[PDB]
Amino acid sequence: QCKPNGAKCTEISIPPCCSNFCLRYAGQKSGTCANR
């Protein structure tokens, strides 16, 4: 309802995602809001 599914995450940026995930991990510099 708030997730874009197919977006990117970063150390300084993150999408809303109410059901999906944000791959803003400590070992990543470009994640992705997607469904689990």
Side-chain angles (χ1 to χ4, degrees), residues 12-32:
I12 6 79
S13 300
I14 54 94
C17 321
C18 276
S19 303
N20 291 30
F21 59 74
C22 174
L23 277 178
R24 211 280 82 168
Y25 215 87
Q28 287 280 90
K29 287 180 180 287
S30 54
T32 178

